[PDB]
UniProtKB/Swiss-Prot annotation:
Stated name of the protein: Protein phosphatase 1 regulatory subunit 7
Tissue specificity annotation: Widely expressed.
Part of the intact protein present: 100 to 358 of 360
LRR repeats: 1-21, 22-43, 44-65, 66-87, 88-109, 110-131, 132-153, 154-175, 176-197, 198-219
Keyword Protein transport: no
Length: 259
């Protein structure tokens, strides 16, 4: 065997998966599993996908030391735990869960992607050890302040949509940012992003932006190709598209319209 895809079944318990030792990828997407167990024997497994299930806790993956990707999207997981042995983990997908705090991931120094969207996290913390982190998704959470990103120096994609962020800050050491998404917040002013020179796409729709002089912060991004500013108070200006066009000459797309 090499890849078992038991997608879309009525599985409620994990069993009779012991004879297969050479399995590298197990896919249990969209089932009714309630507990992770009987998986310790798949030691050379590189990809585990138990997304869209009824999991409430993370367990039974203590022995999968060779895991590279872990998909646990859409479950009932309340706390992040029992992942400390997965040193080779590069991608961690925990979207659409019930997590309230970022914890117990400091041992995953080889993480390149971290997805925690549609959860209940209230504070950005405990990310200081993921210096290899390239993508971080914290959208549709309870975030109120941007912080804890001072050690994500290779961060190139940051998604903070649908939160309660009021001020743009904490992005001092994230100079490699190419995609910054802070749309659907309570931001009133664009600040502290003038050092983000490699920005390509920048979503800031559904905020409270008022002054046109904030676009001076984006002048350093010569590769800025796409910018979203709709549903801001800036759109009340009848030359909203042209004003963005003139201030940001490098962009080829404003909202859903090309230039």
């Amino acid at each position: 065997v090499k890849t078992l895809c038991l997608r879309q079944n009525l599985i409620k318990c994990i069993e009779n998966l012991e004879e297969l030792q050479s399995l590298r990828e197990l896919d249990l997407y969209d089932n009714q599993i309630k507990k992770i167990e009987n998986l310790e024997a798949l030691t050379e497994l590189e990809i585990l996908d138990i997304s869209f299930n009824l999991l409430r806790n993370i367990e039974g993956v203590d022995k999968l030391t060779r895991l590279k990707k872990l998909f646990l999207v859409n479950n009932k997981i309340s706390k992040i735990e029992n992942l400390s042995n997965l040193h080779q983990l590069q991608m961690l997908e925990l979207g659409s869960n019930r997590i309230r705090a970022i914890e117990n991931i400091d041992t995953l120094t080889n993480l390149e992607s971290l997805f925690l969207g549609k959860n209940k996290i209230t504070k950005l913390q405990n990310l200081d050890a993921l210096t290899n982190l390239t993508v971080l998704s914290m959208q549709s959470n309870r975030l109120t302040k941007i912080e804890g990103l001072q050690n994500l120096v290779n961060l190139r994609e940051l998604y903070l949509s649908h939160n309660g962020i009021e001020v743009i800050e904490g992005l001092e050491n994230n100079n490699k940012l190419t995609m910054l998404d802070i749309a659907s917040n309570r931001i009133k002013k664009i600040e502290n992003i003038s050092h983000l020179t490699e920005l390509q796409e920048f979503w800031m729709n559904d905020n409270l932006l008022e002054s046109w002089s904030d676009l001076d912060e984006l002048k350093g991004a010569r590769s800025l190709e796409t910018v979203y500013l709709e549903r801001n108070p800036l759109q009340k200006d009848p030359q909203y598209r042209r004003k963005v066009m003139l201030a940001l000459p490098s962009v080829r797309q404003i909202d859903a319209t090309f230039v």
